[PDB]
Amino acid sequence: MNTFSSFRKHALLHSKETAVKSINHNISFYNLLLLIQRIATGLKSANIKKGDRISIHMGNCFELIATYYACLKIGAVFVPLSLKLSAKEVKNLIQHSSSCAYIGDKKRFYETKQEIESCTMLEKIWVIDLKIEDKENNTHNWEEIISQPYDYSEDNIYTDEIASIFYTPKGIVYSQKTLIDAVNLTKVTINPRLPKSKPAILSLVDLISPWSILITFAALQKGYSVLLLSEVDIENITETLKETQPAWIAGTPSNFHKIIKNEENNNNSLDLSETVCVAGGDSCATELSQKFFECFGSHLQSSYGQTELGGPVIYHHDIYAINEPSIGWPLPGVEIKINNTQSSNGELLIRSPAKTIGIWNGHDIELFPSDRWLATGDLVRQENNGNLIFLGREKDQIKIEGYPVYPIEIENTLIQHADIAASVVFSVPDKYAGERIIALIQPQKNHSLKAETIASYLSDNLAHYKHPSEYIFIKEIPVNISRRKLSNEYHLLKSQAEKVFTL
Ligand SMILES: CCc1cc(C(=O)O)c2c(c1)C(=O)C=C2
């Protein structure tokens, strides 16, 4: 069962239930299938064929998810163009991907119009809410692609065929099978609670971005509705969440930090205690989970994955339950190897059951040996129960007397202190020790804090060789965090510090 046919099967058996909703709109499973079918007929009527590449360039709307499924239905390769791309970058991807069609919305098209229309390989350009004076040459209004009824023509889709190209300047090629296996990984990470009185799934990452594509396919295949928000909706996220009350929210760590910060004001208070929230990336969200529980009483989850691995590969279904920084457990079929360093800690290597096909180089696919391991650049230790303790980036590792020291582990200890609001640990060169550990300490509250408190606190909680040699008290840590750039600004930091304490 490929991704479209899995959607279809569910839509035909659960026709009346809401598949997608926004603040002002909704569409049932059955009507979304009808829209997908009309788009498929319009594409084929416009001479789009299995294997043709379609660049897709639009904000969150029902047409975006319908277009993904229409491409899948007919075997057209979809090429999502991130909304963060400049006009020159969008043109580069349209050209590099060898797209022969483009589908976009009004805002994205008109920001990029001259570039898109100068891509001479584009035989069809469809634009939602195209201005009528611009319907000419190969540029068409979106309504044209759905104007004809479904023609019931067959499609022969095979799981080894290309389905999509997800650009990181590297076009990662997914087959129909990659997408099946990536959605199957993602399905394991979407676990709303049982309602008390139907779950709606929200992803705060744009639907043009691969993690949200997978979340959306997986949610619909589990029969959940998907809530789509606009940029303005997400700028007003606290009020939007009170109104829409999703059961499950995916987002970046930054998304959830902002949600936390909005509560410091407000009044009516947003109740996320029953909501399952999933922070997504290539790091660890343990400190965020502590803040998120304090603020909402909700138990943050995390997902760790990347496009080259097809989908999510490691999932932490309860970050806050683990006192150490951790990233969770490998998903089903995921294989891991921890590089042997003659110790329990090493680089995390991953092989995923969602095998990408290769890299599109503009002219051909550079094929991936299906046995390849991906080196993540992250250090881990695997506990007895499988949980991957997170030791930080390999390149942030500090050496003390020959032994590796991990800033993220020291930071996690420091912030548990009631008087410490935040902390960043890094090293500086030292003529005779090689490196020396510095701790940037941001005092909590409106409170006072003496370094001697910290050194004694660390004696009880950390091995001595992991201890900072020096404390820099500053009541705002520079963010925008790069322990490398902070090391480079060590003398500046000391000169701006509330106080410095050298042991
Ligand atoms: C589709 C591959 C993938 C991409 C990304 C991303 O941050 O872009 C993420 C994950 C998977 C994930 O499990 C959490 C973040």
XYZ file of C-alpha atoms and ligand atoms in Angstrom:
518
model
C 0.000 0.000 0.000
C 1.603 3.224 -1.101
C 0.987 6.620 0.544
C -1.846 7.738 -1.738
C -3.631 4.406 -1.696
C -3.408 4.310 2.112
C -4.994 7.736 2.268
C -7.688 6.727 -0.266
C -8.608 3.559 1.576
C -9.076 5.497 4.785
C -10.989 8.317 3.141
C -13.416 5.874 1.547
C -14.129 4.156 4.853
C -14.306 7.337 6.979
C -15.751 9.675 4.412
C -17.623 12.130 6.635
C -14.929 12.797 9.173
C -12.896 15.989 9.066
C -9.501 15.452 7.450
C -8.072 19.038 7.542
C -9.169 22.179 9.312
C -8.044 25.753 9.648
C -9.461 28.470 11.811
C -12.112 29.281 9.171
C -12.366 26.175 6.997
C -12.564 22.449 7.029
C -12.647 19.593 4.591
C -13.807 16.020 5.102
C -11.771 12.985 4.113
C -14.182 12.293 1.248
C -14.069 15.845 -0.091
C -10.275 15.959 0.201
C -10.140 12.762 -1.888
C -12.440 14.397 -4.458
C -10.129 17.451 -4.617
C -7.059 15.198 -4.976
C -8.756 13.388 -7.836
C -9.625 16.660 -9.647
C -6.022 17.890 -9.290
C -4.731 14.577 -10.658
C -7.016 14.912 -13.667
C -5.930 18.512 -14.258
C -2.246 17.553 -14.100
C -2.709 14.715 -16.551
C -4.894 16.853 -18.812
C -2.027 19.372 -18.869
C 0.316 16.597 -20.054
C 1.992 15.977 -16.682
C 3.093 12.329 -16.656
C 4.526 9.840 -14.171
C 8.141 10.890 -13.497
C 7.703 14.592 -14.306
C 8.971 16.875 -11.532
C 6.694 19.520 -10.032
C 8.083 22.316 -7.836
C 5.632 23.220 -5.060
C 5.905 26.546 -3.377
C 3.090 27.526 -1.002
C 2.092 28.271 2.584
C -0.123 26.018 4.677
C -3.447 25.378 2.922
C -5.685 22.477 1.994
C -4.481 22.731 -1.612
C -0.917 21.930 -0.498
C -1.764 18.561 1.035
C -4.161 17.786 -1.815
C -1.386 18.530 -4.324
C 1.074 16.227 -2.548
C -1.457 13.408 -2.775
C -2.318 14.182 -6.399
C 1.401 13.971 -7.321
C 1.632 10.668 -5.474
C -1.513 9.347 -7.160
C -0.112 9.902 -10.636
C 3.565 9.360 -9.853
C 4.594 12.944 -10.398
C 7.686 13.765 -8.363
C 7.036 16.636 -6.002
C 9.803 19.091 -5.076
C 8.814 21.263 -2.096
C 10.438 24.722 -2.116
C 10.989 26.003 1.397
C 9.441 29.363 2.241
C 12.811 30.455 3.682
C 14.385 30.423 0.198
C 15.175 33.700 -1.546
C 13.916 34.229 -5.111
C 17.350 33.374 -6.539
C 17.436 30.229 -4.421
C 13.962 29.189 -5.525
C 15.007 29.632 -9.149
C 18.148 27.572 -8.522
C 16.097 24.653 -7.139
C 13.513 24.802 -9.925
C 16.355 24.606 -12.427
C 18.500 22.090 -10.532
C 15.544 19.747 -9.942
C 14.689 19.858 -13.699
C 11.105 20.629 -12.791
C 8.712 20.914 -15.693
C 5.836 22.362 -13.673
C 5.347 24.721 -10.715
C 2.392 24.998 -8.271
C 2.401 27.931 -5.873
C 0.182 30.333 -3.990
C -0.310 34.001 -4.558
C 2.105 35.302 -1.919
C 4.994 32.971 -2.914
C 4.554 33.392 -6.665
C 4.405 37.159 -6.744
C 7.535 37.422 -4.593
C 9.301 35.206 -7.158
C 7.436 35.900 -10.383
C 10.217 36.952 -12.743
C 12.468 34.120 -11.567
C 9.804 31.428 -11.864
C 8.638 32.617 -15.268
C 12.187 32.704 -16.618
C 12.636 28.930 -15.957
C 12.200 27.768 -19.506
C 11.757 24.118 -18.575
C 8.457 25.021 -16.796
C 5.674 23.985 -19.172
C 2.905 24.751 -16.624
C 2.870 27.252 -13.765
C -0.310 27.205 -11.640
C -0.882 29.911 -9.000
C -3.652 30.088 -6.419
C -5.315 33.502 -6.777
C -3.297 34.421 -9.886
C -4.172 37.960 -10.986
C -6.076 37.717 -14.222
C -3.735 40.038 -16.132
C -1.015 37.375 -15.507
C -2.832 34.413 -17.068
C -0.710 34.124 -20.212
C 2.003 31.965 -21.801
C 2.479 29.039 -19.394
C 1.062 30.728 -16.282
C -2.386 29.494 -15.230
C -4.808 30.052 -12.398
C -5.078 27.192 -9.889
C -8.813 26.909 -10.637
C -7.875 25.592 -14.066
C -6.271 22.480 -12.594
C -9.494 21.475 -10.800
C -12.055 22.606 -13.391
C -12.593 19.201 -14.971
C -14.333 16.324 -13.174
C -12.266 13.286 -12.271
C -11.791 11.148 -15.369
C -11.325 7.778 -13.569
C -8.135 7.086 -15.543
C -5.826 4.452 -14.120
C -2.367 5.032 -12.658
C 0.337 2.363 -12.331
C 2.519 3.360 -9.355
C 5.308 1.030 -8.142
C 7.047 1.332 -4.810
C 10.561 1.614 -6.258
C 9.657 4.685 -8.365
C 10.702 8.196 -7.393
C 8.156 10.042 -5.314
C 9.827 13.288 -4.238
C 13.064 15.247 -3.953
C 13.688 16.974 -0.619
C 16.469 19.561 -0.849
C 18.578 19.947 2.300
C 22.208 22.009 -2.133
C 21.563 18.256 -1.974
C 18.379 16.851 -3.448
C 17.543 13.813 -1.331
C 15.520 11.418 -3.453
C 12.656 9.446 -1.888
C 10.918 6.567 -3.609
C 7.310 5.635 -2.945
C 8.819 3.046 -0.576
C 11.025 5.612 1.229
C 7.906 7.621 1.894
C 5.895 4.569 3.075
C 8.715 3.671 5.488
C 9.224 7.290 6.604
C 5.509 7.714 7.296
C 5.576 4.409 9.206
C 8.405 5.813 11.383
C 6.464 9.033 11.878
C 3.201 7.251 12.801
C 4.965 5.787 15.918
C 5.691 9.349 17.107
C 2.132 10.688 16.911
C 0.409 9.607 20.122
C -2.388 11.940 21.245
C -4.095 11.031 24.465
C -7.467 9.352 24.628
C -10.083 12.160 24.602
C -12.371 12.490 27.584
C -15.579 13.462 25.684
C -11.416 13.153 16.951
C -7.745 14.167 17.793
C -6.510 17.067 15.693
C -2.762 17.133 14.940
C -0.918 20.428 14.556
C 2.557 20.908 13.150
C 4.038 24.365 13.666
C 6.711 23.659 11.036
C 5.582 24.732 7.535
C 3.781 22.031 5.570
C 6.290 22.608 2.754
C 8.999 21.208 5.065
C 9.616 17.389 5.049
C 8.956 16.694 8.750
C 5.476 18.275 8.456
C 4.778 16.423 5.208
C 5.443 13.153 6.995
C 3.450 14.215 10.057
C 0.528 15.158 7.841
C 0.524 11.875 5.884
C 0.926 9.881 9.085
C -1.853 11.702 10.952
C -4.324 11.310 8.071
C -3.411 7.615 7.737
C -4.183 7.170 11.434
C -7.542 8.907 10.806
C -6.723 12.071 12.757
C -7.577 15.508 11.479
C -4.774 17.943 10.723
C -4.967 21.576 11.835
C -3.322 24.043 9.456
C -2.230 27.486 10.662
C -1.152 30.596 8.782
C 1.873 32.724 9.677
C -0.413 35.218 11.414
C -2.058 32.393 13.354
C 1.332 31.303 14.643
C 2.387 34.825 15.557
C -0.738 34.741 17.726
C -0.075 31.162 18.811
C -1.357 31.392 22.396
C -4.752 32.742 21.331
C -4.847 30.377 18.347
C -4.220 27.389 20.625
C -6.964 28.444 23.044
C -9.356 28.577 20.121
C -8.330 25.479 18.221
C -7.273 23.146 21.065
C -5.258 20.576 19.101
C -4.556 17.225 20.762
C -0.963 17.031 19.513
C 1.530 19.739 18.547
C 4.846 19.322 16.755
C 7.293 22.215 16.662
C 10.914 23.312 16.903
C 12.367 23.908 20.342
C 12.119 27.557 19.488
C 8.353 27.177 18.898
C 7.828 25.829 22.394
C 10.145 28.352 24.055
C 7.974 31.082 22.539
C 4.817 29.402 23.791
C 6.346 29.344 27.290
C 7.417 32.965 27.103
C 3.944 34.162 26.075
C 2.514 32.783 29.349
C 4.653 35.129 31.457
C 2.134 37.762 30.343
C -1.351 36.632 29.305
C -3.957 35.957 31.983
C -6.529 33.312 31.021
C -3.636 30.837 30.911
C -3.330 28.246 28.189
C -3.994 24.674 29.369
C -1.592 22.303 27.597
C -1.724 19.665 30.367
C -3.689 17.177 28.193
C -1.844 18.130 24.976
C 0.997 15.995 23.638
C 3.833 18.218 22.407
C 6.773 16.965 20.316
C 9.928 19.083 19.919
C 11.745 18.156 16.731
C 15.365 18.348 15.590
C 18.923 16.973 15.702
C 19.688 17.819 19.312
C 18.343 17.243 22.801
C 15.365 18.980 24.422
C 15.910 18.017 28.050
C 16.266 21.546 29.462
C 13.263 22.720 27.463
C 11.192 19.812 28.859
C 11.887 21.008 32.414
C 10.735 24.561 31.613
C 7.754 23.228 29.674
C 6.559 21.076 32.561
C 6.976 23.916 35.042
C 4.914 26.169 32.833
C 2.152 23.875 31.597
C 2.338 20.586 33.468
C 2.666 18.938 30.039
C 5.222 16.186 29.402
C 7.315 17.197 26.406
C 8.382 14.605 23.856
C 11.051 14.859 21.240
C 11.779 13.515 17.807
C 15.211 13.265 16.277
C 15.656 12.760 12.579
C 16.744 14.202 9.293
C 15.958 14.036 5.592
C 18.900 11.726 4.725
C 17.494 9.173 7.175
C 14.092 9.305 5.496
C 12.227 10.282 8.616
C 12.305 10.470 12.406
C 14.560 7.748 13.764
C 14.828 8.296 17.526
C 11.894 9.219 19.705
C 11.718 10.360 23.303
C 8.189 9.774 24.516
C 8.863 11.424 27.918
C 11.928 13.723 28.101
C 11.282 15.092 31.534
C 11.140 11.610 33.098
C 14.909 11.257 32.491
C 16.998 13.575 34.670
C 20.054 13.344 32.313
C 20.021 14.915 28.830
C 18.687 12.265 26.532
C 17.261 11.750 23.102
C 15.205 8.645 23.562
C 14.903 5.311 21.827
C 15.434 4.097 18.241
C 12.198 3.671 16.377
C 11.208 0.274 14.907
C 13.717 -1.009 12.366
C 16.229 1.735 13.177
C 19.757 0.377 13.710
C 22.347 2.279 15.687
C 26.043 1.913 16.244
C 28.053 3.824 18.813
C 31.585 4.339 17.662
C 33.986 2.267 19.792
C 36.204 4.671 21.671
C 37.330 2.042 24.222
C 34.713 3.647 26.506
C 30.934 3.746 26.912
C 30.570 7.106 25.051
C 30.911 7.583 21.324
C 29.576 9.010 18.098
C 26.023 7.938 17.214
C 25.783 6.248 13.804
C 22.351 5.429 12.379
C 20.867 3.247 9.677
C 17.186 3.870 8.967
C 14.493 1.502 7.589
C 13.422 4.411 5.383
C 16.128 4.169 2.739
C 16.528 7.205 0.534
C 17.483 6.382 -3.030
C 20.337 8.793 -3.543
C 21.139 12.408 -4.224
C 19.917 14.245 -7.259
C 22.910 16.130 -8.620
C 21.116 18.048 -11.331
C 21.732 15.355 -13.954
C 21.583 11.913 -12.286
C 21.042 10.250 -8.932
C 24.110 9.478 -6.897
C 22.915 6.217 -5.385
C 23.073 5.393 -1.683
C 24.458 1.976 -0.683
C 21.485 0.703 1.317
C 23.845 -0.498 4.066
C 25.467 2.911 4.684
C 25.673 4.313 8.233
C 25.099 8.040 8.754
C 27.526 9.735 11.171
C 25.440 12.205 13.165
C 28.279 14.138 14.827
C 26.489 13.588 18.184
C 27.985 11.735 21.158
C 25.796 9.295 23.089
C 25.825 6.494 25.620
C 23.202 3.781 25.476
C 21.627 2.750 28.779
C 20.475 -0.726 29.728
C 16.931 0.017 28.651
C 18.001 1.378 25.235
C 17.718 5.080 26.049
C 20.378 7.226 24.312
C 21.916 9.582 26.798
C 23.000 12.696 24.962
C 26.543 13.886 25.498
C 26.467 16.763 23.047
C 28.150 17.491 19.761
C 31.440 15.709 19.243
C 32.992 19.051 18.403
C 32.006 20.635 21.734
C 33.761 17.927 23.704
C 36.448 19.160 26.136
C 39.561 17.140 27.111
C 40.733 17.301 30.730
C 43.758 15.253 31.687
C 43.103 13.091 28.626
C 39.402 12.445 29.507
C 36.425 13.759 27.561
C 34.198 16.326 29.299
C 30.781 17.207 27.906
C 29.453 20.761 28.372
C 25.809 19.739 27.941
C 26.177 17.379 30.913
C 27.723 20.075 33.137
C 25.095 22.635 32.071
C 22.332 20.198 32.963
C 23.714 19.866 36.491
C 24.211 23.616 36.970
C 20.710 24.660 35.985
C 19.150 22.329 38.619
C 20.372 24.786 41.244
C 17.560 27.069 42.392
C 19.766 30.170 42.096
C 20.944 29.385 38.519
C 18.613 30.482 35.736
C 20.804 29.449 32.821
C 24.334 28.433 32.072
C 26.678 27.729 29.168
C 29.933 25.729 29.627
C 32.903 25.912 27.235
C 36.661 25.747 27.309
C 39.533 28.083 26.542
C 43.120 27.234 25.667
C 45.477 26.769 28.580
C 49.249 26.660 28.179
C 49.865 23.740 30.501
C 46.471 22.087 30.930
C 45.560 22.226 27.226
C 42.055 23.427 28.010
C 40.354 25.055 30.977
C 36.612 24.833 31.659
C 34.663 28.080 31.968
C 31.049 28.286 33.139
C 28.842 31.183 32.152
C 26.276 31.443 34.977
C 23.026 33.419 34.733
C 21.609 33.922 38.243
C 17.921 33.182 38.770
C 15.136 35.434 40.038
C 16.177 38.781 41.541
C 18.575 36.722 43.633
C 22.192 36.670 44.760
C 24.564 33.784 44.143
C 28.155 33.193 45.245
C 30.523 30.938 43.309
C 31.422 28.995 46.449
C 27.837 27.717 46.514
C 28.324 26.330 43.014
C 31.687 24.668 43.572
C 30.382 22.886 46.671
C 27.180 21.918 44.822
C 29.253 20.407 41.994
C 31.441 18.461 44.468
C 28.319 16.541 45.503
C 27.042 15.975 41.951
C 29.900 15.760 39.409
C 33.342 14.233 39.164
C 35.996 16.798 40.011
C 37.674 16.754 36.601
C 34.403 17.928 35.039
C 34.280 20.975 37.323
C 34.595 24.468 35.835
C 37.820 26.213 36.693
C 36.062 29.590 36.577
C 32.608 31.160 36.834
C 31.465 34.176 34.802
C 28.282 35.666 36.248
C 26.208 37.531 33.663
C 22.503 38.177 34.006
C 21.826 37.817 30.283
C 23.589 35.156 28.225
C 24.104 36.296 24.593
C 21.670 34.393 22.316
C 20.188 35.242 18.887
C 24.310 29.462 21.145
C 27.724 28.240 19.867
C 30.131 27.326 22.617
C 32.877 27.966 20.034
C 31.948 31.608 19.556
C 31.596 32.093 23.309
C 35.098 30.663 23.821
C 36.281 33.152 21.222
C 34.691 35.992 23.233
C 35.981 34.814 26.633
C 37.924 38.007 27.429
C 34.987 40.167 26.281
C 32.627 38.099 28.454
C 34.843 38.532 31.517
C 34.945 42.283 30.943
C 31.161 42.467 30.793
C 30.529 40.102 33.704
C 28.700 40.869 36.916
C 31.603 39.033 38.558
C 34.280 36.493 37.753
C 35.440 33.824 40.196
C 38.564 31.769 39.451
C 39.114 28.661 41.578
C 11.866 14.310 7.320
C 13.147 14.083 8.170
C 13.104 14.911 9.437
C 13.391 16.283 9.413
C 13.362 17.042 10.582
C 13.691 18.543 10.523
O 13.956 19.230 11.560
O 13.710 19.087 9.386
C 13.020 16.469 11.801
C 12.719 15.084 11.832
C 12.792 14.333 10.670
C 12.380 14.788 13.196
O 12.101 13.672 13.547
C 12.387 15.846 14.106
C 12.884 17.052 13.308
